[PDB]
Amino acid sequence: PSGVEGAAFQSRLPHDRMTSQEAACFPDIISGPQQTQKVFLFIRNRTLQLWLDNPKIQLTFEATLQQLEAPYNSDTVLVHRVHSYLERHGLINFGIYKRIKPLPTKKTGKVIIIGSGVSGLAAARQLQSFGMDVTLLEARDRVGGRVATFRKGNYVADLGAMVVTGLGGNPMAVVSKQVNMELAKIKQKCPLYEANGQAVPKEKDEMVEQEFNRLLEATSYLSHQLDFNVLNNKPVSLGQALEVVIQLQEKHVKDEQIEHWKKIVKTQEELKELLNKMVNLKEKIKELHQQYKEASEVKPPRDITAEFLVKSKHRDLTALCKEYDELAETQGKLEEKLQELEANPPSDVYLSSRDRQILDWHFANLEFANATPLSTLSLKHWDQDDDFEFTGSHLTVRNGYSCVPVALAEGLDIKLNTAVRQVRYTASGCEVIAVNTRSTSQTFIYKCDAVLCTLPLGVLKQQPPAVQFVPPLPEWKTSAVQRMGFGNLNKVVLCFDRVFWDPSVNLFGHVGSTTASRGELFLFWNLYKAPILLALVAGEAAGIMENISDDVIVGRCLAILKGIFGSSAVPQPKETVVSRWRADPWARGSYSYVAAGSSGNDYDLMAQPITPGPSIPGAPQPIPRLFFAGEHTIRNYPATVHGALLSGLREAGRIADQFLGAMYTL
């Protein structure tokens, strides 16, 4: 879309309808008359358009009203309510922009942000823009968290986030205009290469892939239409479901054969009954011919009875010869009907070992996309976020993704090498106890009005806990933490001195030997300016390959590449890097997935802030003190950068509303 309505789409909002969040802030309008609403919606959309058309400068209420028309610019308290609402929830003026009105003289309220991942940084920038005292505590020696970017010489490769998943509605599309991001499209095509090192034929390729998608759609049918979602009390995984589908597909292949051969024996048994009849007729024709012959040996003259006997036997024979000719007719029809059925048999097998191997690569792809064994994904919900995916080509940050968190970090109080150990929240406020990662006995205490926690789900999962909450987090929250899935996927960076692969092909697969190793080095990326190949380790294999040294991994890398490109066409890699996210103490995995027994609803539970008990018993209900942002908190955009980004924006708004008050609700 384009124009005013396109801005609403780009901002993930329906252009012609008021959202649930809008209904909360403008309950007068939404319950009011249809005319008012359309005015409101326009004002909203028009303001968004303005900010979007130029996101490198702050959009003020002045500048907004300036560029509005009649009758829309007549009511200025409406325009102000709109502008503020949008600015509060980071729909306008977010990221890196030049401020027209320099920051307020002095700050209001104090917020400690745990972790300087993208969600953290996003929220921090916002809160500071709202004029609050903000300090981030990063355990690492760098910003970005799960946005890691390897750099050496001219080699640049992302060990974490890498792909901008389409600009159509992406808040990152805004960010990319604010930051020097070199965005390059990824060409869809991905040729496969079997264990031998030779390409899968386009005949096979196209119609294994087809079967894959067909098998997926099948599981969806099991899930929704058949409601196959519980089995022995345990929730059904996607893996379980796929297995069941494949089995039912193998069963059908056999059922076809059985009823086909069963049709042959029913015709083969008709032929048997006919041949028996034909033999018994040739028996009696043999006998009757003899009798007629003997009757014709009686030379004339003969009396009438003896004359009749010759005539009789003649008739009786041509009668039986008539029948046999009609039976030889029937034999001719059934004899070709047997050659009919035996000519075109049904499918021999559902999939061969060679087929099933290529299909396992497609499962590995799915296991990569979810960063987890398909036996862990929720059947019903694994894809619950589908309706919200952005439009457009997927792109790669060619100059490295780190450029984004780094750029966001500018002008922020970030305490690097500071590992939070304990969060203490009470009715009167919060203290955060952290240590120095280097000399771990050196302690820090932080006092604040509110704590925003952007700790990765894998961290919140640790047992025994890496961070202690005082008081303990409520049962509903910890249940959500356990229920949810935190996955794992690793990357192998190979830096060569020369390009030896197809320069116009961005990615190519490798089909592994067994199901067990289907994710092991199953995919390779050529994206960057420099000659760098990037190899993915996914699924079950991801977890195990962490116990294996770099040399051994880089070995297996070259082994596969040699088999594909030539034993002497693959040189020794100048620089090599291997990720270990599950081992990394500040991640404990890669990103989240909807685990079996979980749902999208859990992601909402994660976002719900914690309100402490009262100090003095019988004193009023306190303020919410402990807030959560992060990739694992955003139901509609989990496991992404923009997801984290938006969660950050979200919490900042909620915190600001809480501590600076919402003026825009009159």
Add this chain to the structure above:
Amino acid sequence: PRLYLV
């Protein structure tokens, strides 16, 4: 999620 599928 499904978004990353190659």
Add this chain to the structure above:
Amino acid sequence: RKPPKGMFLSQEDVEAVSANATAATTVLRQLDMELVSVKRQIQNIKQTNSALKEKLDGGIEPYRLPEVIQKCNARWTTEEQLLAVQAIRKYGRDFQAISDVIGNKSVVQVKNFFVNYRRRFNIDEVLQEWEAE
């Protein structure tokens, strides 16, 4: 509404393949043994039929009696009358058979005879004795 075309997933079959731990492998083997059972039964009857076909070798060629294309006549020679009475005794009301035995009489002329000479050839007595067989 319905499974993607080519995929076969009935409510019943889902329950059957997920009845226990390896109810999946059980069902797939019952059919694997069924397939063997039927496939050897094919070759059994294919063998049985192959034998019955060799016993029909040559057809009925050395047993065919050449076509006697003769012109239908109106007069009843006393010979033809006697062939009739005998054909009646042997075939009953099968007018077609009788017509072939005599050869030069149409199926209707045979029926005609049955009424005209019914008087003199006691055709009632002749027919009731044919029934007694």
